[PDB]
Write a protein that binds this ligand. Structure first.
Ligand code: CLR
Ligand code: CLR
Ligand code: CLR
Lengths: 415, 415, 415
């Protein structure tokens, strides 16, 4: 297993090496801040390199993806699935937020915050939106420009751009290809930077252990964060998905668990939603009787854009980092977290080697320090194996629901 | 008339509804500023959305238009017309400025202002020109960057870009198409935003009536502004156009009025310069004897780029808004108004549903608040019907002049 | 000679006229600062126009050049030459720096400066890199954004972009052409602006003579700068090139001078490295016995990218301008000078009429005033005639070395 997938093993070896070095080097003496900064510099370089690519990645990905929307996607069978795919995911994100505001791991007015959010969804300058944001200062009130990339405004403008360009048809073919090419270029860059990741991440972990000032309380926070992520996973899956299934399909939601149990076990084992497709097909279309015309569209697309466990993960983890730094997010950034987690959930599986840039996207969207992200990587190998399970269960329930919202249409189209 | 052109009726209904709501709601009690801002927020959103599109609109339009210049446009018959089209329009703009500085509706050195203007025509950074400008502060002097998009520098650079790219020929065909596509995209956006305009504009009008602090003096300013716009229209048309005609063509300029009177009446009635073309053709080439080789080029292009009433309108209206806000423009912004009005006059008819973004372009070029633009929309339906008349008369005089600067050339090319 | 090459004669006439006007006008009375600024304004306009094009020039040139790298460039015969071409040039630049820090014409910590340099090679925002840079202020330390274009970060990002896009192959053909077209456009602009150069440069020279406050000491600095440039040229060529030749080729490096003496004389006379190619071919492949398979690749490419005299010139001249202004560059800007001189050396011969924008690139890279560049132009005609000689000698030694690193390969490929 040391030759296949030589990126997870390298990252875990880097994490272990950084932890050992931090433990052995904080034992010597109070370490000078300058040499601590020198030690942690490679991690800062890595995160600067990763943040350098967020804007081109967003611009390329939104334009490329929104140009691939087809009205011939098996008729309504597509759109219904989409209405499912963006629904549950959003709920998951919101649920995660609630839990991270209830468990509280890691111990301006509201109207003005919401007005600033609405203003930021509609920026006045597109070039200024790339590196600045707006806020209401007070002494009458006035509006002042703060530093920080306007993620939501750019995302909204380019969503509108992609929607308007997809309606041009074949006339705008030279541009859809253009951005298309750009996508691979930036994706190639993301492949190279993540190869330097094992050497950088370790350094950051060392920089987090040398100057933590307390080892017994940070390990309690990193345990409570795992506890709330796990609790969110069970709540979302076990309660909501059968409940959403029963209020629409109106059949027994436990026979569905009985039918897709092998797919759940395979997802737990392999920890990959794409490699579970052969098992989940044989489960859905043989054990439950779902028509082949539904699964062959729902499952391959849900395995790429229906990541409802990653959304909850990313909604919990951003507010956890904010709580560790003492930042109390107002109501204008809770919505930003809930939206950016939903957007990043879709791009986490569509973009290869994108599990560390999607968190940076949220952190920069809400303006949080990005040096506490090192601790998140140290515990990802304990959580992904059952984030994948929740993703697979969400795909299976969507496939079971679309067969109940399109049974009559298939029956009529057969005859 | 409630089904055809369901944008002007919607806007006038919104204006009336906003006026009624503002009158009935200022009668109740002194309204809290926070709820006034909440009421006017949709208009702010609308103007943010409209200002978001100015830079891409300029970049696309200049490149697309300047690439369509052909040297085979009936030989000199084209260029002479162009020399006319950009001449009178400029004069109109300048005349408007003079009048708005003489009637005065709505009661740093000059050398440094002109030097700052010349510096802004040649920016040092293209990305910084999109959101910043330069100015001379004083205590030796020094140069400091102020906020505000540099419209003139971007316009000049992209004029040079389009001129240089049009000389490449067929080699630069992949790029002219590229920007070409972009044009429709942004134009499509301008079509959507102006559908939300009826709901937004009304709100702004309400926000202008609730907190105006005086109703008897603002209605006097809005009357004097109409008076000066009307006076400018009669001066420009009646005095200048026959006078410019007589010093070149050297024939009677009143027989020309006698010949094109039906076209003037049709322009007054229909209030559209494009729909008057069938009448103005039958007037020019049948009542006055203009050769068909001149009119068939002059009229269709003059109906799109020779808008000499809109230039005077936009030059008067920007300085009127500046005077309402107490801003006294120096000599460096009078030239900016005179230039941006000329540029926006051409783009007002070329870009559909662009009569509210062209004024925002001038306001942001000279850095003026854009909440007083709501009052301009309330009186546009009283002025456009005779702005169109001036535009049609200017087209007709240009067609009558080009036939006197190209009579011998046509006579020789016939034999 | 007044009809052929009517750009150098125009520039020298402008320099002489400006010098005469400055001498005759400083004799009258102490000249008012406002009229001095008015006199020097055309030069400021010229340099604003030249700086407006640096970013698009860099973006187009890096992408276009890095997409033309072929692995079929005579096998290794290409890459070895490249390893030579970028080696000696770099050495030259470094040597120049040493000399300008030793002769000293024109009489934060180091760790933090190097950390800021490394941070600037990896910017966090691409749009912000176009007009801003980062630095470590002190009261704990903190990082603050300063004004000034981030040349190194943009150059590194677009080098990575071009390398990644060149590996896509034929798939990314629509984009390589796109930027390709852009190149000519911006190059055309550089051709037009340099036609206005003779009128602008003169004004700046006048502005440098009216308010110099001392004529006897500035002429001593302009003499010592020429002395150090000359000393650098002889050191680099005469010492290093034979020495680099002897430690690799291991033959007599003076017989090589004896063989290429005619090419050196022709380069001194014509002062053009491209026009010396017919003489240097007949020297290398007839007097020294170099195989035709080596010279026909080494010489045409070395005449365009192996400009090792221009690199030393530009490394000396930037620090000379910094020393004239009293600026003491730290260790983070010495490296920036050494890198930007190497990058600008390649682009000085690849881009026509680019000898005044390449110096502006370095000056803006290290953030220096660009009004002392006028004095550099007044003495360029005394130095270029033997910068070209050093360039030709460097090309010849590279051709003589590649024939010693590829003799066996050619012998085997012959049979
Ligand atoms: C973390 C950031 C940088 C990622 C950027 C978000 C991108 C990747 C998201 C936003 C919207 C998403 C797209 C929405 C719609 C579709 C159509 C579907 O048939 C294929 C997937 C595709 C194309 C999605 C791919 C991923 C996507 C483009
Ligand atoms: C944001 C808006 C107001 C600014 C855009 C200004 C644009 C639309 C203006 C500036 C110059 C104008 C162009 C000037 C020259 C020509 C050539 C003519 O044969 C067709 C019209 C055309 C192509 C004009 C179209 C409109 C134009 C492109
Ligand atoms: C100095 C600023 C303004 C411009 C930046 C320098 C530009 C011109 C440099 C950067 C990299 C350079 C390229 C690098 C290597 C090669 C390979 C050679 O076989 C063709 C020329 C080419 C492609 C060079 C052309 C010039 C180049 C593109």
């Amino acid at each position: 297993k040391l030759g296949k997938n030589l990126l997870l093993t390298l990252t875990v070896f880097g994490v272990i090496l950084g932890a050992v070095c931090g433990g052995l080097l904080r034992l010597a003496s109070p370490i000078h801040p300058d040499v601590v900064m020198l030690i942690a510099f490679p991690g800062d370089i890595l995160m600067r390199m990763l943040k350098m690519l967020i804007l081109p990645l967003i611009i390329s990905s939104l334009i490329t993806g929104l140009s691939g929307l087809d009205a011939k996607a098996s008729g309504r069978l597509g759109t219904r699935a989409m209405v499912y795919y963006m629904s549950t995911t959003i709920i998951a994100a919101v649920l995660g937020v609630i839990l991270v505001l209830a468990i509280h791991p890691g111990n301006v007015s509201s109207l003005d915050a919401f007005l600033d959010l609405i203003r930021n969804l509609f920026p006045e300058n597109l070039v200024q939106a790339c590196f600045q944001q707006i806020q209401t200062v007070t002494k009458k009130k006035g509006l002042e420009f703060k530093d920080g990339m306007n993620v939501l405004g750019l995302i909204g403008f380019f969503i509108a751009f992609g929607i308007a360009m997809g309606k041009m048809g074949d006339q705008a073919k030279l541009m859809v290809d253009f951005f298309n090419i750009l996508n691979e270029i930036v994706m190639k860059l993301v492949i190279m930077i993540m190869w330097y990741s094992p050497l950088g991440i370790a350094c950051l972990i060392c920089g987090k252990i040398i100057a933590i000032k307390d080892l017994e309380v940070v390990a309690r926070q990193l345990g409570m964060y795992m506890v709330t992520v796990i609790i969110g996973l069970i709540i979302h899956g076990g309660i909501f998905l059968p409940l959403i299934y029963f209020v629409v399909t109106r059949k027994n939601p436990f026979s569905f668990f009985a039918g897709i149990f092998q797919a759940w076990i395979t997802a737990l084992g392999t920890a990959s939603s794409a490699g579970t497709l052969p098992v989940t097909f044989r489960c859905l279309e043989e054990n439950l009787g779902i028509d082949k015309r539904v699964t062959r569209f729902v499952l391959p697309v849900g395995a790429t854009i229906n990541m409802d466990g990653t959304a909850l993960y990313e909604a919990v983890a951003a507010i956890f980092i904010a709580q560790m730094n003492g930042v109390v997010l107002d109501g204008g950034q809770i919505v930003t977290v809930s939206l950016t987690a939903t957007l990043a959930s879709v791009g986490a599986a569509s973009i290869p080697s994108a599990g560390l840039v999607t968190m940076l996207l949220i952190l920069t969207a809400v303006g949080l320090p990005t040096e506490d992200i090192s601790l998140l990587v140290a515990v990802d190998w304990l959580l992904d194996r059952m984030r994948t399970s929740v993703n697979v269960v969400g795909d299976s329930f969507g496939a079971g629901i679309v067969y109940h919202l399109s049974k009559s249409e298939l029956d009529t189209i057969d005859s």
